[PDB]
Structure 1
Amino acid sequence: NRTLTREQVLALAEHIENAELNVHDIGKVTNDFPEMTFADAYDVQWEIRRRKEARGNKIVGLKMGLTSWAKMAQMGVETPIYGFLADYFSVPDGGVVDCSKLIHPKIEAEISVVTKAPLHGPGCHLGDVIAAIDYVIPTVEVIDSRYENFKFDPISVVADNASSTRFITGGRMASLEEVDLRTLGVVMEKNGEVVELGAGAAVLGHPLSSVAMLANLLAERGEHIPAGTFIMTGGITAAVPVAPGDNITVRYQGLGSVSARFI
């Protein structure tokens, strides 16, 4: 189920990460390696993780992509995808994002959770996740595909760490008792303009299910979700471009707001 040699994985991971580190967009790697499988792409992504860990970055969480059934079908995929978060991805609520360090960033409103118990697959589901949640926390992701290409290419995107680049936690944390995630309304404003609306159920029908899918995806590689893991469950709103000078504020129903300033 793999077509990349070890040397190719290592080279691809270096190439792709270099696009992020040097803020330089590249051609999607599936154009040069069309035989690349998702397993290949995850091999590349996890090698990027190791590259970051090797230079001392902490891996501080995981994020989900393609958490819309409709988008999955249109991307021809059967499950979401995931990526990892590095420490330097983190932006404090109200904080600054330096667009000169990014290629073509977009933001999306999400709900993250931190688990208090381990989750594993296969066959993990909502019941398991619900019992394992410590708290939830409003989070806006800044995603930035390192590819110059227009059309989404899920295998390339996976290899590019699911386009992860920054995340902004904010608003108020709550326990699952205090929030109904399916009906959790989200309003994204950019420069004062309401640009996107969404409700938590836009993530699979239930945002917490994304965490179960994450556990099941991880199980395929003999991995699981340790207790204490921070997971961004997926895009509640469509992704919205941001540019220097933009200020954004995402309002979470009953959970305050997340904001960020782009320069």
Structure 2
Amino acid sequence: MFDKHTHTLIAQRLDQAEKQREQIRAISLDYPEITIEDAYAVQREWVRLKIAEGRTLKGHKIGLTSKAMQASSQISEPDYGALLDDMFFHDGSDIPTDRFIVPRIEVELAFVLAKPLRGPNCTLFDVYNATDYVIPALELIDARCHNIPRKVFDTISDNAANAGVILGGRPIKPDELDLRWISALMYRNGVIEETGVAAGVLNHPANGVAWLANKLAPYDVQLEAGQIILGGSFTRPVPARKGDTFHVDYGNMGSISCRFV
């Protein structure tokens, strides 16, 4: 573990990278001995910094769910990041492309909590009990560190690649239908680029939420009522470029659209 001073410095550089839309060198290259604990400490510092600037915590996301599952990727479990108020964009809105560096769109489900979730021993059943609504959600992810390589410690430090969130479609009670079989078609500029099924997220798209509550418990942190929790992408991320229209069709769960300007 590094000194807190080091964590703060790395966070400051990530912050400047985001604000200037200019990537820094991969943190893992400058800090070869960085640990997963250091990476989450950098994240916590950056989130603290951004909230001090006037932002508000609105929830969390669980990421790297596919890579955590797939056998031929070295990664052993998912990651997590914090969602801030300024990350949220309305369904059907213009997204300012110049605000981002290498943005990509992911297809997810969001859990809107009615009740807090606190670890350890948080279970899928606790998630069901605490969830007010499930709603489709797109994530816009980005990278403040250069890719050419980059590692998981860099992504985690970099607030798990968080940049944007777009909620939309049909809100449902958790018991309304089997969440495992929610499916989606991601269109970009009139063409299907990816498809996926929600079970591709950790066997059940709610599993990440309980896992997250358990990860946050040691820090005396819980998932608060009113928070929005993004469970993971059931598609590979798709690059977003200026002029692109996205339309993600979740069938009977509705759709989410946006345009990059």
TM-score range, shorter chain: over 0.9
Q: State the partner residue of 2:75.
A: 77
The alpha-carbon deviation at position 236 of structure 1 amounts to 1.2
Q: State the partner residue of 1:112.
A: 110
| Unaligned stretches of 5+ residues in structure 2 | none
Alignment of 1:61-76 (within 5 A): 61-68=59-66, 70-71=68-69, 74-76=72-74
RMSD of the alignment, in Å?
A: 1.5
SS of the residue 2:252 aligns to: coil
Q: State the partner residue of 1:47.
A: 45
Q: State the partner residue of 2:247.
A: 249
Q: For 2:164 and 2:124, how far apart are their aligned partners in 1?
A: 27
Q: How many residues align?
A: 261
Q: State the partner residue of 1:102.
A: 100
Alignment of 1:116-131 (within 5 A): 116-131=114-129
Q: After the TM superposition, which parts of structure 1 deviate over 4 Å for at least 4 consecutive aligned residues?
A: 69-75
Q: State the partner residue of 1:93.
A: 91
Letter paired with 2:77? T
* CA gap 1:244/1:75 in 2 versus in 1, 3 angstroms: same
Q: State the partner residue of 1:36.
A: 34
Letter paired with 2:241? A
Contact 1:93 1:169 in 2 (8 A): yes
The alpha-carbon deviation at position 94 of structure 1 amounts to 0.5
* CA gap 1:174/1:151 in 2 versus in 1, 3 angstroms: farther
The alpha-carbon deviation at position 180 of structure 1 amounts to 1.8
1:156-196 per-position Cα deviation (integer Å, ceiling 9, x unaligned): 11100001001111112111122321000111000010111
| Unaligned stretches of 5+ residues in structure 1 | none
TM-score normalised by the chain length of structure 1 = 0.95
Contact 1:187 1:252 in 2 (8 A): yes
Q: Of the candidates 192, 195, 198, which is equivalent to residue 194 of structure 1?
A: 192
Q: State the partner residue of 1:176.
A: 174
Q: State the partner residue of 1:163.
A: 161
Q: State the partner residue of 1:133.
A: 131
Q: For 1:142 and 1:211, how far apart are their aligned partners in 2?
A: 19
SS of the residue 1:109 aligns to: strand
Q: For 1:59 and 1:76, how far apart are their aligned partners in 2?
A: 31
Q: For 1:194 and 1:182, how far apart are their aligned partners in 2?
A: 21
Q: For 1:59 and 1:115, how far apart are their aligned partners in 2?
A: 14
The alpha-carbon deviation at position 99 of structure 1 amounts to 1.1
Letter paired with 1:34? P
Letter paired with 1:63? K
The alpha-carbon deviation at position 261 of structure 1 amounts to 0.3
Letter paired with 1:227? A
* CA gap 1:69/1:16 in 2 versus in 1, 3 angstroms: closer
SS of the residue 1:60 aligns to: strand
Contact 1:242 1:262 in 2 (8 A): yes
Contact 1:191 1:246 in 2 (8 A): yes
Give percent identity, aligned residues only.
39
Q: For 2:32 and 2:67, how far apart are their aligned partners in 1?
A: 25
Q: For 1:219 and 1:152, how far apart are their aligned partners in 2?
A: 29
The alpha-carbon deviation at position 125 of structure 1 amounts to 1.9
Contact 2:26 2:149 in 1 (8 A): no
TM-score normalised by the chain length of structure 2 = 0.95
1:67-92 per-position Cα deviation (integer Å, ceiling 9, x unaligned): 12655655533321110111111110
Contact 2:69 2:77 in 1 (8 A): no
Contact 2:117 2:126 in 1 (8 A): yes
SS of the residue 2:195 aligns to: strand
Q: For 2:248 and 2:86, how far apart are their aligned partners in 1?
A: 21
Are 1:225 and 2:213 counterparts? no
Contact 2:181 2:198 in 1 (8 A): yes
Contact 1:75 1:152 in 2 (8 A): no
Q: For 2:46 and 2:211, how far apart are their aligned partners in 1?
A: 22
1:128-174 per-position Cα deviation (integer Å, ceiling 9, x unaligned): 11111100111110000112114551111110000100111111211
